[PDB]
Amino acid sequence: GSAKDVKFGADARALMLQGVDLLADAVAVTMGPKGRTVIIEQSWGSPKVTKDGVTVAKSIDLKDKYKNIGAKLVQDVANNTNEEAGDGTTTATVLARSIAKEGFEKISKGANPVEIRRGVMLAVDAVIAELKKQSKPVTTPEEIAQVATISANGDKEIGNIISDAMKKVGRKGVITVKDGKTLNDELEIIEGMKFDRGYISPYFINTSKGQKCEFQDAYVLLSEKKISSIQSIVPALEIANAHRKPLVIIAEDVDGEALSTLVLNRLKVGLQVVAVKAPGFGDNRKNQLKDMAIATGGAVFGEEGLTLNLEDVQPHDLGKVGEVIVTKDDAMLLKGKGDKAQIEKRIQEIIEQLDVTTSEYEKEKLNERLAKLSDGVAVLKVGGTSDVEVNEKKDRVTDALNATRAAVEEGIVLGGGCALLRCIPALDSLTPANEDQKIGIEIIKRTLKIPAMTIAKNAGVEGSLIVEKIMQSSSEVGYDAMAGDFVNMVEKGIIDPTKVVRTALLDAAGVASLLTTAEVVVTEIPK
Amino acid sequence: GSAKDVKFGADARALMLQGVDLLADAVAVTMGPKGRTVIIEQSWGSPKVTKDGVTVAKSIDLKDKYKNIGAKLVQDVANNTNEEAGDGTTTATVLARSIAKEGFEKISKGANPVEIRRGVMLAVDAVIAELKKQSKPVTTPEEIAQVATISANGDKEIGNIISDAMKKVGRKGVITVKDGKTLNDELEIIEGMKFDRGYISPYFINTSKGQKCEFQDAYVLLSEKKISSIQSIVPALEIANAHRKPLVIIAEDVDGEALSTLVLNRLKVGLQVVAVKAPGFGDNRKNQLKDMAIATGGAVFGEEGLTLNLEDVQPHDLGKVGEVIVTKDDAMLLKGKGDKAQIEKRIQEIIEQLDVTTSEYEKEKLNERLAKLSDGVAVLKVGGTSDVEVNEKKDRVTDALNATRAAVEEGIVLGGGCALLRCIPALDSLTPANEDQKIGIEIIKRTLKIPAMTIAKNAGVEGSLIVEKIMQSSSEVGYDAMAGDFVNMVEKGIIDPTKVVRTALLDAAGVASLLTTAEVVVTEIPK
Amino acid sequence: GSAKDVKFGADARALMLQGVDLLADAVAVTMGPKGRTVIIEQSWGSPKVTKDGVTVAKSIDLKDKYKNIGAKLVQDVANNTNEEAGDGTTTATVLARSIAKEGFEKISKGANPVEIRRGVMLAVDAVIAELKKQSKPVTTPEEIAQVATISANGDKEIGNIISDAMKKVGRKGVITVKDGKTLNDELEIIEGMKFDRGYISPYFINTSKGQKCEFQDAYVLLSEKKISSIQSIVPALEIANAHRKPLVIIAEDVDGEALSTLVLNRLKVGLQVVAVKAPGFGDNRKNQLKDMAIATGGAVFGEEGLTLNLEDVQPHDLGKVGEVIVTKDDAMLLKGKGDKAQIEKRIQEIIEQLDVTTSEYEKEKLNERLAKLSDGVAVLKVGGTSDVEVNEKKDRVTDALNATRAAVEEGIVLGGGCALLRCIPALDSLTPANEDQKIGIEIIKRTLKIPAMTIAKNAGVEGSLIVEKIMQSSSEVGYDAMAGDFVNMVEKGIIDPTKVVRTALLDAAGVASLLTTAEVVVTEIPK
């Protein structure tokens, strides 16, 4: 459709590499504990100061349309490493740059770049198998704290709060990072069923100190449909008044007649009653109301599947809770007097629904519901003086959470780039099929030294001598870039998730080996 | 999305500092009692002439996109100091510039800027602890006048007019700065319940001198809903006529039939009656009408929670006031004959609602309601010849009010930048963990002299000699920039709020230490 | 309409060839097993890395409007070869460039380019007849795997799964290439009737493990129109309950009364019943419902042609299936207890409708229906680390599928360009009518060596010496570009489809011989 510019051979490959080396030099400065931080100008407001590889990579676009192709491919590498792993984007960026450079240097007239790519993938599969061979499972919370500390730029107070959250809500539990209005971070553990729905009317308040609505051992009434008529709410009030028990009515809404009855009974005779909207808008609303009915111990009125009417209310069919807190912004239920067998059956139903869904938005909803039935959720509030500090620390806390989850799921290997340095003996025992696959095997063999070299280079010391001292040392001795000496990496706590390393290596290698098969580059003419 | 320009190392850090030094030189000229004033061009009309640090900072944007990043970060420093404290924005600006300069000068190949930042925050926490150690509470109104005088550029009349307002309406009372049409400032104390609602009909006037509607010992009828029918207003008029007491009807509105009845009864037989609209539009109208219900001694008719009907009106159901003044623009109620216990209970309810809200717009409403139930509010009308004078003086009056509130809340330390000069012995007793945290501790140690140096530099004298004479003097002796000698600064009245100093230092240090961790700057290409 | 630029003679033919040689040099680098790969800039997102001839050709447009004509004509050559054959676009591109060059070189004052074109088409018809003479039918699945391996750039793991898919679903069966979320490719064979329609209500689930709705030996009720009334669904439930058989109701939709009846019966008494929407929107919905009626063994109710009512349902009118699985996204029917004679009659009807349609969108629908009634369909999921890998491999899998189908339809000749090299003895036995047709015969004779020369040139060796060794060898000996030696092409497995070769040659030759009749070129003036 538009006029094109076509470039051939090494005149193009030298240009695309110029886009890689420009984008992978702004990322490699953020690697390791001694790496520095990149400021990106934001158009709407204040600049974004970040140490994240995928945030630096995604913000670099080049005016030259031949360098922009290499920039976009390394952006793809970093973005894929962020998507599948959540950490190790800088390592993937520098590995992709190294593979691109080594593959561009090795292209000759008789060379076959496709067989070089095949050798690269064969060597990478061998390295991934060796990484899975040398992994160890996480068995103690000390290793959890060590992983979260290493992944958060050596911040011990972030590892110690993520480890506490995983100890409280479970290792496979819901932990959410949130903005904080204080100077220091904090951890909030939410137990029971708390939903962001307030009371319908402010006259239900019986606690003057916190402006809350609090009862003990309260009856629970639930409904899918809106409650409007007098006859649909009076019999539940008769069960509440006869047994002398408080009532909380969770519904879609309570309309004018039912509201008038509830507030008039609350203010005049002294009946204890509160009305709360139900959380959700669609099928999640139905699922949360059914979860509430299972946890409380009663049946939920007005379901579409089964004919249940609010006109006939029985005492066994109303739920029971030991504690209910309803405020203006949220409502909270604890100690539901349900049956544990049905709660476990609902947990199994949610787990089996989780195992078959892939929408990435339903999964969060069923995880939240499962955590509400389980020990609860955790909220890490990140504190700082300004929004820039909060965003910078929130990036590191999110990276630490993702790396802690990846270490839970798969395992831990040595950190500091020393995991890939012990997979070079695995590459030295490979027999290439032809001379072209040997080139790819040597490319991958020379690439495994790059992360440790970059970590040592950002620390100011010479990367090559440090790496050569690492390989000549024992299998447990590695360089500590913060302290500057050679230590036992497991004992000192420098460990990495296996999933992060084997994701970064593969996602770098595939895209870079596909890039190094290029001869002709077609771009648009700059209008 | 757009083409980017990427800069590396000291070629970028020298540019961003050029945006800091440009922004923090236009602010540092306004520091101290001998500081000068900055004129900013306004596009719509007359230029804005101001001495406020945050107003000068927020008005500076630079065409170079590398200098604009440093400009935006110092803007963030000034804006955060203005939000959290309301004063000390120039001090935060100059502290941020000094920390940025000292951190940029100390970056080498082997240096770790993250550990330098950690040392900076460690030193800042030590200085903040020392500042809280040496603070004194405000115990006399003389110190209140001294704080408001120092914060208003040495204006003794502003300090006196704020000390008098705090003596009249209370230290934690509502004081509002307003435009004045005279040459001199004035203070207006509004007692009782005054709301900006006039009478419905001009025929209710019984005072010819001021065109006001005034009664003594009047009945009060309050209506939630609009009054339209004859039967909803006649029985209240029967209670008013039988007891021979004036009646004021505060409602949403008075419609045609009730209005015709009221004006016809007022003009024909001589019944004393006035109708006023209710202040507010939503829930604030409900809360204000309830406040008048408790304050007057009656119950508000037509409430949604409890069925109250205007058709049956009892003499105990009507409030009583000792004084009512209704004009065209406002209505005024004093000496309500309510019960003091219920008034105190309503005050406690408003206070407990204040302690749990964070919307920053509801807080003003509950503060206004609490002050209406309390001694009252104060209005400082700022006088001047032109609008530029009123705006320039209003900035200083607002700064004095914010600093007086901050001195009430936390305490007072020595002014003139001498509060931070006595925290250098606190820094000299710190043991840094490594060589990189020692750099940050020395950066903060060299930064604590900067406010006193800037104050002395704006006075024309040499800052370094003055600071060295301050540090070699006693703990109470400091420089007086207005008079030019070394005086006992507590006895002379040069004091500062502790909250302002410890806010400016922290908000400068966090953002500037985050800025000094930069190596790569990514900006947009100027199209 | 617009101002035109007119060029005459060799000043124009030298320009248009400059557009051919620019477009056919970016394609010829992708030829053979040692050919390289072209990166094309995409405006919206990541660049497209590809080896396809027609994708490289269609993405090249030139700013010069005289070169763009030759570029557009070679684009037409590649696009026609892609439409008619699906493979061999690079061969057609290089043959078109060679014919254009040889015809442009031979134009003189006395030459007749129209008779040169006539000689070109005469020689091409002779070569096509010789190619059809030397073809062999595909008789073993080993040749199928060899063809799919050669067409997929020597990937044995693609040819193996394509051969397995053709062995499972039949050689003339539906095979669909799809995106994969894994690292490796996979093959999914779908048997029976599977349609992408879920259940109406989630309460029909009776399998907790997979959240599926599964029965065995179930009755099937099929409805053309929507089911809403009570009386239209009750008698079918009576047949289901009396015989104690599960029921699946495939309809347009099930409305509120019927849904309430179905879920209430499913939850209360325990009747096994599921409601599924019908697949399709128009006549395809009718045809699919009729096919399900024939396969299951019942009659579809509510058809427009014949008056069938849901109020009277007989046990013989309901279909029977041995296994039904209904999930949220799809339904599955297997082992329909229909009559084989009517199923074969429906298969014959679908085949006879296929033989008379040419819309290219109905053909896919009847092929899908025929495969659903036949062994089933196959889905090849292409795996990769990133989207670029998946697209690059999907192009080769799509090429291998099309070449395998073309080898099924017509036959196989020698690969590596050795098919056209054995048709030059066929050209040496032609007697030209005049001197101008002899020029075209010699042009085609010199063009038949071009594919083998290009394959040998991309391998780094000299094309002319390799070709001259090929024609001096036996009829079965050809160059293996991957291994670099002269081998028996049939025994080593280097074979090509006859249809692909005879399509590429003809589509190149016609358009290039029409191009070589040019004397005057009229273009638009570049505004």
Ligand SMILES: Nc1ncnc2c1ncn2[C@@H]1O[C@H](COP(=O)(O)OP(=O)(O)OP(=O)(O)O)[C@@H](O)[C@H]1O
């Ligand atoms: N004290 C340390 N000594 C040596 N190596 C360390 C130390 N702390 C961390 N590392 C190593 O530094 C690397 C962490 O680098 P960094 O976190 O900056 O980037 P990343 O994980 O590749 O990507 P992302 O920017 O997405 O976090 C890991 O290889 C880790 O093992």
Ligand SMILES: Nc1ncnc2c1ncn2[C@@H]1O[C@H](COP(=O)(O)OP(=O)(O)OP(=O)(O)O)[C@@H](O)[C@H]1O
């Ligand atoms: N007579 C004085 N002698 C010495 N120092 C003084 C005197 N009066 C005020 N100061 C000091 O000068 C500073 C006041 O500066 P200024 O009010 O211009 O700026 P600020 O408070 O930092 O910010 P803002 O511009 O927002 O008001 C305080 O440190 C105060 O203690």
Ligand SMILES: Nc1ncnc2c1ncn2[C@@H]1O[C@H](COP(=O)(O)OP(=O)(O)OP(=O)(O)O)[C@@H](O)[C@H]1O
């Ligand atoms: N190992 C081999 N040795 C020799 N020739 C080979 C070998 N493998 C394939 N070929 C030949 O290379 C050609 C395949 O080229 P290629 O697949 O790149 O292009 P194409 O089929 O013309 O078009 P498209 O780009 O659409 O796939 C065929 O002529 C095939 O016979």
Ligand SMILES: [K+]
């Ligand atoms: K990083």
Ligand SMILES: [K+]
């Ligand atoms: K100032």
Ligand SMILES: [K+]
């Ligand atoms: K090709």
Ligand SMILES: [Mg+2]
């Ligand atoms: Mg990390």
Ligand SMILES: [Mg+2]
């Ligand atoms: Mg001030």
Ligand SMILES: [Mg+2]
């Ligand atoms: Mg092909």
